[PDB]
Amino acid sequence: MRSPGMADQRQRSLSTSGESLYHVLGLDKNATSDDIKKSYRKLALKYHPDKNPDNPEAADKFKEINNAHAILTDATKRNIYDKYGSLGLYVAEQFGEENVNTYFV
Numbered sequence: 001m002r003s004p005g006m007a008d009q010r011q012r013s014l015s016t017s018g019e020s021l022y023h024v025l026g027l028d029k030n031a032t033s034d035d036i037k038k039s040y041r042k043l044a045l046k047y048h049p050d051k052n053p054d055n056p057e058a059a060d061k062f063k064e065i066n067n068a069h070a071i072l073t074d075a076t077k078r079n080i081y082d083k084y085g086s087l088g089l090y091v092a093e094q095f096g097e098e099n100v101n102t103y104f105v
Contacts, residue, residue, distance in 0.1 A: 004082045010105060014063060016085025021068040028072045040069035069093060 001008050005019040022028030027039035047062040049055055067086045070093035071077040077093040084092065084101075091100050 002083050005085055008084070008087075011085055011087040012105075014067075014086045014090055016087050018067075018071070018081040018085040018089060020064065020086075021071050021081065021089075024064045024068040025072075027068070029078075031073065033073045036073040037069065039072075040065050044069075063090070066090065067093060 005017055007016050025039040025043055027036050031039065043065040044062060045051065047058045047065060049059040049062065052058040064086060067089045071081050071089055074093070076097070077089055080088045080092045080097050084097075088097060088101060091097070091104060
């Protein structure tokens with residue numbers, strides 16, 4: 001289905017809340033392709049479970065910040081955002097909806 005921010009039959013991995021993107025890091029289309037990324041970055045090494053052991057939630061945070069990274073400034077990922085929540089973006093933003101999503105489920 002094309003319901004934004006809803007759990008689809010294909011979206012079964014992470015928590016499909018593309019709506020939380022801006023809230024994930026505190027950025028959304030206000031920043032350039034520069035700051036949107038910075039926003040994710042300062043969280044990425046911040047919330048990295050490698051740096052924060054015994055914290056599975058940190059991995060979880062690292063996983064949502066992993067997502068919002070592209071979407072906010074990237075029209076393509078924001079386009080997937082309207083279709084796929086965190087799942088489609090998790091794969092499309094990091095590798096590309098065209099190549100890997102067509103390979104996964």
